Amino acid sequence: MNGARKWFFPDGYIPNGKRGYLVSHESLCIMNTGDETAKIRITFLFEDSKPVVHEVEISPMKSLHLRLDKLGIPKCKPYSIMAESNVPVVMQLSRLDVGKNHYTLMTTIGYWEEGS
Amino acid sequence: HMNGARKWFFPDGYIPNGKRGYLVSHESLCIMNTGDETAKIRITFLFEDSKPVVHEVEISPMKSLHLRLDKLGIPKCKPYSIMAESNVPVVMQLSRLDVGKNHYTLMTTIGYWEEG
Amino acid sequence: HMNGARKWFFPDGYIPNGKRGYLVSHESLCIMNTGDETAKIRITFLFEDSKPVVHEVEISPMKSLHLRLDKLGIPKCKPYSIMAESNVPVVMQLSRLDVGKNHYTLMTTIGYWEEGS
Amino acid sequence: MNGARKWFFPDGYIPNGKRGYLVSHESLCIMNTGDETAKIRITFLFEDSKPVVHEVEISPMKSLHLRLDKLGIPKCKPYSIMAESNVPVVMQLSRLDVGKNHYTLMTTIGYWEEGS
Ligand SMILES: [Cl-]
Ligand SMILES: [Cl-]
Ligand SMILES: [Mg+2]
Ligand SMILES: [Mg+2]
Ligand SMILES: [Mg+2]
Ligand SMILES: [Mg+2]
């Protein structure tokens, strides 16, 4: 099976703090253990705005740590993620919240469905 | 057709009382609804030696909702657990921000799900 | 229809030894019972080079229980894993607070479940 | 049998910071509640490099907190993990990111498949 075709992450938020050259961010980590390249449609849902959809690809037997703070998503704006792939993959979302006086990480494997 | 589950569970609930400037410790129950109908969600809070308390919230179609649990009248520094039941499938994640004059940390997890 | 699963697993267990003020480093095995019957839970601790240690707890209907694992006689700073078995479906989450004079951090995860997906 | 034969962790990364005896690392925690020793093949996937595979064993009714920073994996290089066992097991991945001025933990149970 090598994963699932749909992944969901309800708690999305790009903090705006930084420390030196290290900036707060979220990384949507995706892995493809299959033999086919994965085309993934990433839908971002907001609290009072319409959805925004991005697209990425990940080659066979490769990892991809996608920096969500580089997609034009407004910083400090709550959102949720729905990712749909044409082939099974596995995803995990991690957040780094840093500032002059703080530095913390949090992570979770996502909720999955479709060819689990 | 639809994505998610109707029931979500989060055993580790706790609202810290620490404050850091204008920032206050809290927990955010993040919910996403990828469906076409508004989700009506009943959130039940279970305690260790007190009876349950139930709240209600709604999330519009294709929207995200980061619910601040520290704004519901739940006693601070009181362990609890959460059972959330929706009329339509949704996805949930619970995150906690514990902050104080000398600390700042985050933790999160996708919840356990049922019926979806 | 009951909610939860009868078996829960948490591979990363560890009780840190630091403290700060009123707080001490610890792990909290949080369990919830949304059913109509009391849950009798057998908690097994597995170690890397030692034999298992088993504890027992009970949780009444529609109640929460945040079990402090640092108060069970488990050696501090000794890696372990947890297998929990309940007579009725429940839901569990494990969280760790690692604190000291110069650090304070939390981590958590819903556990892996079996028999009641 | 308790557990699953395949486990996946998309967000792998070994930080390079240290603080005294403390060294940043990731611990792949595995538990075997079965009666037979588990032979586990751990595959590491990278963003622009080929996979690297390691092997470990875990005795019956034992825990194993595997230090991933002791396997020759380049530090500060994103990767993902796929672990395959001949018998059912359960896995969790935790990261300690520590330095002169920070100390933080994050963790998640992994995505699983081929499990009872
Ligand atoms: Cl975490
Ligand atoms: Cl998690
Ligand atoms: Mg922290
Ligand atoms: Mg954390
Ligand atoms: Mg910290
Ligand atoms: Mg987590």
Tab-separated table of C-alpha atoms and ligand atoms in Angstrom:
chain	number	residue	atom	x	y	z
A	1	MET	CA	0.000	0.000	0.000
A	2	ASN	CA	2.847	2.362	0.900
A	3	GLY	CA	0.671	5.009	2.531
A	4	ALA	CA	-2.557	6.821	1.695
A	5	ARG	CA	-3.770	9.176	-1.012
A	6	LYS	CA	-5.361	11.836	1.208
A	7	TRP	CA	-3.858	13.553	4.268
A	8	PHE	CA	-5.320	16.139	6.648
A	9	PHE	CA	-3.799	18.581	9.150
A	10	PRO	CA	-6.264	20.819	11.026
A	11	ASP	CA	-3.756	23.012	12.892
A	12	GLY	CA	-1.850	25.173	10.441
A	13	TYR	CA	-0.251	28.466	11.462
A	14	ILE	CA	2.959	30.194	10.382
A	15	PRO	CA	4.409	32.162	13.343
A	16	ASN	CA	6.270	35.390	12.515
A	17	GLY	CA	9.121	35.327	15.022
A	18	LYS	CA	12.769	34.762	14.176
A	19	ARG	CA	16.141	34.279	15.864
A	20	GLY	CA	19.147	35.262	13.798
A	21	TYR	CA	18.596	33.651	10.404
A	22	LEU	CA	16.267	30.995	11.810
A	23	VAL	CA	12.649	31.924	11.090
A	24	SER	CA	9.449	30.380	12.439
A	25	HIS	CA	7.823	28.037	9.955
A	26	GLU	CA	5.888	24.876	9.329
A	27	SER	CA	7.193	21.965	7.318
A	28	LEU	CA	4.816	19.592	5.575
A	29	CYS	CA	6.928	16.465	5.296
A	30	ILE	CA	6.006	13.965	2.612
A	31	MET	CA	7.554	10.626	1.750
A	32	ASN	CA	7.029	8.473	-1.336
A	33	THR	CA	8.072	4.834	-0.983
A	34	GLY	CA	6.402	3.817	-4.233
A	35	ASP	CA	7.782	3.369	-7.750
A	36	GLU	CA	5.738	6.187	-9.293
A	37	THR	CA	6.217	9.952	-9.030
A	38	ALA	CA	3.537	11.537	-6.855
A	39	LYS	CA	1.580	14.598	-7.969
A	40	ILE	CA	0.085	16.214	-4.893
A	41	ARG	CA	-2.596	18.892	-4.712
A	42	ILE	CA	-2.377	20.759	-1.405
A	43	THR	CA	-5.515	22.647	-0.412
A	44	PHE	CA	-5.326	25.310	2.286
A	45	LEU	CA	-8.545	26.136	4.146
A	46	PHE	CA	-8.990	29.291	6.192
A	47	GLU	CA	-11.382	30.565	8.849
A	48	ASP	CA	-12.988	33.350	6.798
A	49	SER	CA	-11.306	33.196	3.381
A	50	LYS	CA	-11.710	30.858	0.416
A	51	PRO	CA	-9.352	27.910	-0.265
A	52	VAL	CA	-5.969	28.209	-1.965
A	53	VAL	CA	-4.487	25.232	-3.796
A	54	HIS	CA	-0.819	24.493	-4.449
A	55	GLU	CA	0.861	21.628	-6.275
A	56	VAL	CA	4.055	19.679	-5.647
A	57	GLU	CA	5.681	16.507	-6.898
A	58	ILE	CA	7.828	13.929	-5.155
A	59	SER	CA	9.917	11.323	-6.959
A	60	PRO	CA	9.954	7.590	-6.094
A	61	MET	CA	11.784	6.633	-2.898
A	62	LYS	CA	12.352	10.256	-1.905
A	63	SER	CA	11.547	12.596	0.970
A	64	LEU	CA	10.254	16.161	0.670
A	65	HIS	CA	10.169	18.620	3.569
A	66	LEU	CA	7.968	21.373	2.149
A	67	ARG	CA	8.452	24.789	3.761
A	68	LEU	CA	4.933	26.195	4.024
A	69	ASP	CA	6.184	29.688	4.898
A	70	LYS	CA	7.395	30.074	1.309
A	71	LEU	CA	4.032	29.638	-0.433
A	72	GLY	CA	2.589	33.122	-0.017
A	73	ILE	CA	0.370	32.020	2.851
A	74	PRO	CA	-0.276	34.982	5.176
A	75	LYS	CA	1.776	34.701	8.359
A	76	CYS	CA	-0.090	34.484	11.661
A	77	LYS	CA	-3.253	33.315	9.904
A	78	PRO	CA	-4.878	30.059	11.081
A	79	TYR	CA	-5.469	27.454	8.390
A	80	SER	CA	-5.929	23.733	7.778
A	81	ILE	CA	-4.456	21.414	5.172
A	82	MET	CA	-5.957	18.777	2.901
A	83	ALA	CA	-3.464	17.059	0.613
A	84	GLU	CA	-4.507	14.749	-2.208
A	85	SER	CA	-2.039	12.564	-4.096
A	86	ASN	CA	-2.458	10.398	-7.192
A	87	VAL	CA	-0.357	7.707	-5.490
A	88	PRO	CA	0.049	6.590	-1.852
A	89	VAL	CA	2.339	8.735	0.327
A	90	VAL	CA	2.755	9.495	4.036
A	91	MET	CA	2.704	12.945	5.609
A	92	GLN	CA	3.667	14.664	8.858
A	93	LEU	CA	3.357	18.337	9.851
A	94	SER	CA	5.815	20.081	12.155
A	95	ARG	CA	5.966	23.640	13.401
A	96	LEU	CA	8.956	25.616	14.637
A	97	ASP	CA	7.905	28.650	16.680
A	98	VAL	CA	10.974	30.748	17.465
A	99	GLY	CA	11.745	34.245	18.645
A	100	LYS	CA	14.374	36.195	20.541
A	101	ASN	CA	13.359	34.497	23.785
A	102	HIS	CA	11.688	31.229	22.778
A	103	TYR	CA	12.218	28.161	20.592
A	104	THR	CA	9.778	25.262	20.413
A	105	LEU	CA	8.763	22.379	18.146
A	106	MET	CA	5.548	20.374	17.819
A	107	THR	CA	4.603	17.664	15.343
A	108	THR	CA	2.046	15.082	14.360
A	109	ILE	CA	1.469	12.406	11.783
A	110	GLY	CA	-1.671	13.452	9.917
A	111	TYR	CA	-5.115	11.903	9.622
A	112	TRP	CA	-5.284	9.776	6.475
A	113	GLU	CA	-7.735	8.091	4.138
A	114	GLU	CA	-8.163	6.622	0.644
A	115	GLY	CA	-6.101	3.496	0.061
A	116	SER	CA	-4.638	3.292	3.558
B	1	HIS	CA	-17.222	11.163	-0.881
B	2	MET	CA	-16.635	13.219	2.268
B	3	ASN	CA	-13.418	13.378	4.280
B	4	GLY	CA	-12.899	12.810	7.974
B	5	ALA	CA	-14.788	11.212	10.845
B	6	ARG	CA	-17.792	12.179	12.971
B	7	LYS	CA	-16.192	11.555	16.371
B	8	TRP	CA	-12.835	12.767	17.695
B	9	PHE	CA	-11.145	12.145	21.044
B	10	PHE	CA	-8.343	13.941	22.900
B	11	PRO	CA	-7.446	12.438	26.301
B	12	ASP	CA	-4.932	15.074	27.417
B	13	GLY	CA	-6.692	18.373	27.977
B	14	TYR	CA	-5.339	21.054	30.309
B	15	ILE	CA	-5.387	24.848	30.262
B	16	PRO	CA	-2.180	26.175	31.863
B	17	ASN	CA	-2.464	29.428	33.815
B	18	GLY	CA	0.889	30.879	32.784
B	19	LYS	CA	1.033	34.232	31.019
B	20	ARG	CA	3.809	35.784	28.944
B	21	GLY	CA	3.141	39.456	28.351
B	22	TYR	CA	-0.008	39.628	26.234
B	23	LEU	CA	0.274	35.936	25.384
B	24	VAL	CA	-1.715	33.495	27.508
B	25	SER	CA	-1.383	29.716	27.832
B	26	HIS	CA	-4.168	27.892	26.033
B	27	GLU	CA	-5.266	24.931	23.987
B	28	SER	CA	-6.593	25.193	20.460
B	29	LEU	CA	-8.982	22.535	19.184
B	30	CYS	CA	-8.486	22.850	15.440
B	31	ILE	CA	-11.242	21.604	13.174
B	32	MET	CA	-11.502	21.458	9.391
B	33	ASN	CA	-14.599	20.794	7.278
B	34	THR	CA	-13.998	19.828	3.653
B	35	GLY	CA	-17.672	19.054	3.067
B	36	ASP	CA	-20.519	21.047	1.532
B	37	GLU	CA	-22.608	21.322	4.702
B	38	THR	CA	-22.014	23.287	7.898
B	39	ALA	CA	-20.819	20.952	10.637
B	40	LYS	CA	-22.659	21.119	13.965
B	41	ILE	CA	-20.256	19.907	16.635
B	42	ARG	CA	-21.007	18.970	20.224
B	43	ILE	CA	-17.868	19.104	22.356
B	44	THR	CA	-17.971	17.173	25.611
B	45	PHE	CA	-15.393	17.843	28.312
B	46	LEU	CA	-14.775	15.014	30.798
B	47	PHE	CA	-13.048	15.592	34.134
B	48	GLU	CA	-11.364	13.462	36.788
B	49	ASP	CA	-13.839	14.069	39.622
B	50	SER	CA	-16.449	16.424	38.153
B	51	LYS	CA	-19.351	15.834	35.779
B	52	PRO	CA	-19.182	16.587	32.027
B	53	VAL	CA	-19.616	20.009	30.457
B	54	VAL	CA	-20.821	20.283	26.877
B	55	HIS	CA	-20.311	23.075	24.371
B	56	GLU	CA	-21.453	23.583	20.792
B	57	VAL	CA	-19.711	25.080	17.772
B	58	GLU	CA	-20.263	25.215	14.021
B	59	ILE	CA	-17.847	25.167	11.101
B	60	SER	CA	-18.889	26.286	7.624
B	61	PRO	CA	-18.190	24.321	4.406
B	62	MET	CA	-14.560	24.274	3.232
B	63	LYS	CA	-13.383	26.238	6.260
B	64	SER	CA	-10.954	25.900	9.159
B	65	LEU	CA	-11.726	26.690	12.796
B	66	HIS	CA	-9.093	27.089	15.508
B	67	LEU	CA	-11.208	26.981	18.673
B	68	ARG	CA	-9.630	28.599	21.738
B	69	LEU	CA	-10.578	26.321	24.620
B	70	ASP	CA	-9.411	28.817	27.249
B	71	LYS	CA	-12.369	31.051	26.350
B	72	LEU	CA	-15.141	28.588	27.244
B	73	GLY	CA	-15.267	28.914	31.026
B	74	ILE	CA	-13.327	25.696	31.581
B	75	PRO	CA	-11.413	25.846	34.882
B	76	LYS	CA	-7.710	26.513	34.350
B	77	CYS	CA	-5.196	23.991	35.676
B	78	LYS	CA	-7.849	21.276	35.722
B	79	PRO	CA	-7.176	18.052	33.790
B	80	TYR	CA	-9.857	17.063	31.299
B	81	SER	CA	-10.459	15.048	28.141
B	82	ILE	CA	-12.390	15.912	24.998
B	83	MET	CA	-14.947	13.993	22.954
B	84	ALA	CA	-16.238	15.899	19.933
B	85	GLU	CA	-19.161	14.644	17.866
B	86	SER	CA	-20.147	16.108	14.498
B	87	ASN	CA	-23.180	15.575	12.261
B	88	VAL	CA	-20.847	15.355	9.257
B	89	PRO	CA	-17.248	14.148	8.831
B	90	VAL	CA	-14.514	16.581	9.907
B	91	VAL	CA	-10.881	16.318	11.012
B	92	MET	CA	-9.479	17.507	14.336
B	93	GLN	CA	-6.141	18.271	15.987
B	94	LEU	CA	-5.411	19.546	19.515
B	95	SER	CA	-2.471	21.786	20.347
B	96	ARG	CA	-1.355	23.282	23.630
B	97	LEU	CA	0.707	26.401	24.211
B	98	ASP	CA	2.194	26.500	27.703
B	99	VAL	CA	3.840	29.862	28.345
B	100	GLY	CA	5.159	31.831	31.283
B	101	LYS	CA	7.680	34.512	32.182
B	102	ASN	CA	10.426	31.930	31.716
B	103	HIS	CA	9.044	29.258	29.372
B	104	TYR	CA	7.292	28.798	26.035
B	105	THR	CA	6.441	25.386	24.629
B	106	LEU	CA	4.090	23.714	22.152
B	107	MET	CA	2.772	20.168	21.797
B	108	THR	CA	0.198	18.746	19.401
B	109	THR	CA	-1.467	15.623	18.115
B	110	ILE	CA	-4.024	14.514	15.593
B	111	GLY	CA	-6.874	12.975	17.585
B	112	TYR	CA	-8.233	9.446	17.728
B	113	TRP	CA	-11.189	9.170	15.347
B	114	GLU	CA	-14.315	7.067	14.964
B	115	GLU	CA	-17.101	6.757	12.393
B	116	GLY	CA	-15.836	8.180	9.124
C	1	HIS	CA	-21.997	1.735	20.249
C	2	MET	CA	-18.892	2.272	22.394
C	3	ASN	CA	-16.056	4.724	21.722
C	4	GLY	CA	-12.370	3.897	21.718
C	5	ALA	CA	-10.227	0.783	21.716
C	6	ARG	CA	-9.275	-1.842	24.280
C	7	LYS	CA	-5.521	-1.772	23.643
C	8	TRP	CA	-3.145	1.201	23.469
C	9	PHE	CA	0.598	1.406	22.798
C	10	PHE	CA	3.212	4.112	23.432
C	11	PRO	CA	6.787	3.243	22.388
C	12	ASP	CA	8.569	6.319	23.758
C	13	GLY	CA	8.452	6.350	27.540
C	14	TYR	CA	10.999	8.147	29.721
C	15	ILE	CA	10.826	10.002	33.040
C	16	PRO	CA	13.358	12.891	33.027
C	17	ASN	CA	14.959	13.887	36.354
C	18	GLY	CA	14.833	17.688	36.273
C	19	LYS	CA	12.603	20.075	38.203
C	20	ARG	CA	11.617	23.745	38.458
C	21	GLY	CA	9.669	25.262	41.326
C	22	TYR	CA	6.558	23.187	42.013
C	23	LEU	CA	7.020	21.166	38.824
C	24	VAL	CA	9.038	18.009	38.269
C	25	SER	CA	9.698	16.343	34.918
C	26	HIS	CA	7.164	13.615	34.237
C	27	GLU	CA	4.941	11.803	31.794
C	28	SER	CA	1.177	11.740	31.997
C	29	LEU	CA	-0.707	8.806	30.531
C	30	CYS	CA	-4.090	10.362	29.874
C	31	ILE	CA	-7.076	8.062	29.602
C	32	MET	CA	-10.723	8.822	28.920
C	33	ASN	CA	-13.767	6.597	29.348
C	34	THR	CA	-16.887	7.747	27.494
C	35	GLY	CA	-18.731	4.503	28.196
C	36	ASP	CA	-21.309	3.378	30.744
C	37	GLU	CA	-19.081	0.889	32.558
C	38	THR	CA	-15.969	1.340	34.676
C	39	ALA	CA	-12.758	0.571	32.824
C	40	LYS	CA	-10.223	-1.736	34.456
C	41	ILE	CA	-6.869	-1.123	32.824
C	42	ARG	CA	-3.685	-3.176	33.053
C	43	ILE	CA	-0.634	-1.067	32.195
C	44	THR	CA	2.506	-2.940	31.168
C	45	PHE	CA	5.899	-1.228	31.093
C	46	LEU	CA	8.555	-2.776	28.845
C	47	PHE	CA	12.240	-1.928	29.199
C	48	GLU	CA	15.367	-2.283	27.080
C	49	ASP	CA	17.234	-4.764	29.294
C	50	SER	CA	14.860	-5.430	32.186
C	51	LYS	CA	11.690	-7.459	32.567
C	52	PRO	CA	8.166	-5.953	32.466
C	53	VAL	CA	6.425	-4.211	35.356
C	54	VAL	CA	2.627	-4.137	35.472
C	55	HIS	CA	0.337	-1.611	37.155
C	56	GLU	CA	-3.449	-1.337	37.354
C	57	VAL	CA	-5.873	1.590	37.342
C	58	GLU	CA	-9.621	2.094	37.042
C	59	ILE	CA	-11.633	4.867	35.413
C	60	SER	CA	-15.323	5.478	36.047
C	61	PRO	CA	-17.894	6.156	33.288
C	62	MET	CA	-17.660	9.550	31.566
C	63	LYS	CA	-14.444	10.451	33.374
C	64	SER	CA	-10.888	11.501	32.563
C	65	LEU	CA	-7.711	10.269	34.233
C	66	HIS	CA	-4.301	11.890	33.832
C	67	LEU	CA	-2.036	9.233	35.332
C	68	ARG	CA	1.309	10.535	36.599
C	69	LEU	CA	3.838	7.900	35.553
C	70	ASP	CA	6.578	9.442	37.710
C	71	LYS	CA	4.692	8.338	40.833
C	72	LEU	CA	4.719	4.598	40.104
C	73	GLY	CA	8.201	3.597	41.241
C	74	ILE	CA	9.503	3.462	37.676
C	75	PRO	CA	13.220	4.297	37.556
C	76	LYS	CA	13.902	7.829	36.341
C	77	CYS	CA	15.994	8.302	33.201
C	78	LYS	CA	15.290	4.749	32.070
C	79	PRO	CA	13.749	4.246	28.615
C	80	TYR	CA	10.576	2.175	28.460
C	81	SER	CA	7.461	1.518	26.385
C	82	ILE	CA	3.825	1.169	27.402
C	83	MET	CA	1.134	-1.343	26.494
C	84	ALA	CA	-2.250	-0.687	28.078
C	85	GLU	CA	-5.106	-3.192	28.050
C	86	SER	CA	-8.666	-2.285	29.042
C	87	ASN	CA	-11.762	-4.429	29.543
C	88	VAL	CA	-13.820	-1.745	27.779
C	89	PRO	CA	-13.001	0.747	24.993
C	90	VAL	CA	-11.110	3.883	26.054
C	91	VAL	CA	-8.852	6.471	24.408
C	92	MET	CA	-5.301	7.285	25.474
C	93	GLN	CA	-2.656	9.952	24.925
C	94	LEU	CA	0.865	10.229	26.366
C	95	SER	CA	2.545	13.535	27.140
C	96	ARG	CA	5.943	14.349	28.561
C	97	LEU	CA	7.108	17.417	30.455
C	98	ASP	CA	10.893	17.745	30.484
C	99	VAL	CA	11.822	20.610	32.780
C	100	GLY	CA	14.895	21.911	34.554
C	101	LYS	CA	16.425	25.137	35.806
C	102	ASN	CA	17.230	26.090	32.209
C	103	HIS	CA	14.617	24.309	30.058
C	104	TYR	CA	10.896	23.542	29.832
C	105	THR	CA	9.364	21.549	26.995
C	106	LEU	CA	6.296	19.447	26.188
C	107	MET	CA	5.645	16.716	23.619
C	108	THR	CA	2.600	14.528	23.092
C	109	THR	CA	0.933	11.988	20.872
C	110	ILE	CA	-2.275	10.030	20.629
C	111	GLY	CA	-1.245	6.380	20.926
C	112	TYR	CA	-1.438	3.464	18.506
C	113	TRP	CA	-4.651	1.523	19.147
C	114	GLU	CA	-5.971	-1.974	18.556
C	115	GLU	CA	-9.328	-3.732	18.908
C	116	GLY	CA	-11.725	-0.826	18.501
C	117	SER	CA	-10.720	1.249	15.481
D	1	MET	CA	-0.874	-9.924	17.423
D	2	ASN	CA	-0.271	-6.425	18.791
D	3	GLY	CA	1.197	-3.883	16.400
D	4	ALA	CA	1.887	-3.501	12.693
D	5	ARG	CA	4.648	-4.697	10.385
D	6	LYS	CA	5.328	-1.388	8.621
D	7	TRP	CA	5.861	2.076	10.118
D	8	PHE	CA	6.437	5.456	8.464
D	9	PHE	CA	7.807	8.782	9.732
D	10	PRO	CA	8.005	11.589	7.154
D	11	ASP	CA	9.775	14.234	9.245
D	12	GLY	CA	13.304	13.109	10.005
D	13	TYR	CA	16.099	15.532	10.843
D	14	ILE	CA	19.094	15.362	13.164
D	15	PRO	CA	19.914	18.858	14.520
D	16	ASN	CA	23.560	19.682	15.278
D	17	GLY	CA	23.253	21.634	18.524
D	18	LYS	CA	24.619	20.440	21.863
D	19	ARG	CA	24.560	21.487	25.524
D	20	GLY	CA	27.001	19.729	27.822
D	21	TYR	CA	26.074	16.042	27.865
D	22	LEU	CA	22.974	16.833	25.808
D	23	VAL	CA	23.187	16.276	22.059
D	24	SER	CA	20.422	16.973	19.546
D	25	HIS	CA	19.053	13.727	18.178
D	26	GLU	CA	16.066	11.690	17.137
D	27	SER	CA	15.013	8.502	18.854
D	28	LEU	CA	13.088	5.887	16.916
D	29	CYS	CA	11.335	4.024	19.700
D	30	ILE	CA	10.178	0.501	19.019
D	31	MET	CA	8.317	-1.927	21.242
D	32	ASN	CA	7.823	-5.647	20.727
D	33	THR	CA	4.991	-7.216	22.730
D	34	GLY	CA	5.200	-10.475	20.811
D	35	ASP	CA	6.893	-13.789	21.562
D	36	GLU	CA	9.422	-13.714	18.709
D	37	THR	CA	12.455	-11.474	18.191
D	38	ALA	CA	11.674	-8.760	15.660
D	39	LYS	CA	14.023	-8.247	12.715
D	40	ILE	CA	13.538	-4.707	11.454
D	41	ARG	CA	14.783	-3.160	8.224
D	42	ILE	CA	14.915	0.628	8.538
D	43	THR	CA	14.996	2.567	5.276
D	44	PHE	CA	16.008	6.222	5.242
D	45	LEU	CA	14.814	8.310	2.288
D	46	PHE	CA	16.332	11.669	1.381
D	47	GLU	CA	15.374	14.650	-0.765
D	48	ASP	CA	18.122	14.333	-3.386
D	49	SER	CA	20.076	11.218	-2.396
D	50	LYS	CA	19.468	7.468	-2.658
D	51	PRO	CA	18.063	5.417	0.260
D	52	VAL	CA	20.191	3.977	3.055
D	53	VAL	CA	19.048	0.864	4.894
D	54	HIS	CA	19.921	-0.251	8.416
D	55	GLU	CA	18.874	-3.298	10.414
D	56	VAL	CA	18.050	-3.783	14.074
D	57	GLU	CA	16.560	-6.478	16.265
D	58	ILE	CA	14.337	-6.260	19.321
D	59	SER	CA	13.760	-9.132	21.741
D	60	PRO	CA	10.288	-10.257	22.909
D	61	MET	CA	8.570	-8.033	25.479
D	62	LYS	CA	11.274	-5.377	25.226
D	63	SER	CA	11.605	-1.699	24.335
D	64	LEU	CA	14.283	-0.182	22.107
D	65	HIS	CA	14.961	3.550	21.936
D	66	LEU	CA	17.146	3.712	18.822
D	67	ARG	CA	19.419	6.760	18.608
D	68	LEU	CA	19.314	7.769	14.952
D	69	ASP	CA	22.230	10.178	15.354
D	70	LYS	CA	24.562	7.193	15.788
D	71	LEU	CA	23.971	5.612	12.371
D	72	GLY	CA	26.167	7.760	10.141
D	73	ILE	CA	23.213	9.774	8.863
D	74	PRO	CA	24.378	13.267	7.860
D	75	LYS	CA	23.344	15.850	10.434
D	76	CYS	CA	21.095	18.719	9.358
D	77	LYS	CA	19.861	16.730	6.371
D	78	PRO	CA	16.112	16.135	5.969
D	79	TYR	CA	14.987	12.535	5.589
D	80	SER	CA	12.037	10.195	6.086
D	81	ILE	CA	11.819	6.744	7.633
D	82	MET	CA	10.111	3.535	6.531
D	83	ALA	CA	10.571	0.593	8.892
D	84	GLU	CA	9.597	-2.968	8.021
D	85	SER	CA	9.419	-5.745	10.619
D	86	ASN	CA	8.928	-9.491	10.187
D	87	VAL	CA	6.588	-9.430	13.187
D	88	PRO	CA	4.144	-6.799	14.505
D	89	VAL	CA	5.643	-3.947	16.555
D	90	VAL	CA	4.748	-0.355	17.455
D	91	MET	CA	6.876	2.710	16.747
D	92	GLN	CA	7.142	6.356	17.776
D	93	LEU	CA	9.629	9.034	16.662
D	94	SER	CA	10.816	11.839	18.929
D	95	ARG	CA	13.253	14.660	18.330
D	96	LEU	CA	15.330	16.633	20.810
D	97	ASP	CA	16.576	19.913	19.362
D	98	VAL	CA	18.976	21.412	21.887
D	99	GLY	CA	21.616	24.114	21.873
D	100	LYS	CA	23.240	26.742	24.065
D	101	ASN	CA	20.002	28.733	24.197
D	102	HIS	CA	17.211	26.265	23.415
D	103	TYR	CA	15.852	22.843	24.352
D	104	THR	CA	12.716	21.410	22.785
D	105	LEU	CA	10.993	18.078	22.176
D	106	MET	CA	8.413	16.911	19.633
D	107	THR	CA	6.980	13.457	19.021
D	108	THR	CA	4.431	11.422	17.143
D	109	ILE	CA	3.208	7.878	16.846
D	110	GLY	CA	3.901	6.829	13.263
D	111	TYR	CA	1.634	5.942	10.362
D	112	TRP	CA	1.246	2.169	10.192
D	113	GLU	CA	0.086	-0.568	7.858
D	114	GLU	CA	-0.037	-4.356	7.677
D	115	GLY	CA	-1.089	-4.459	11.321
D	116	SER	CA	-3.665	-6.442	13.300
E	1	CL	CL	4.599	17.322	19.956
E	2	CL	CL	1.333	13.311	17.502
E	3	MG	MG	9.654	23.483	23.779
E	4	MG	MG	7.031	20.300	21.807
E	5	MG	MG	11.311	25.273	24.893
E	6	MG	MG	2.857	15.172	18.637
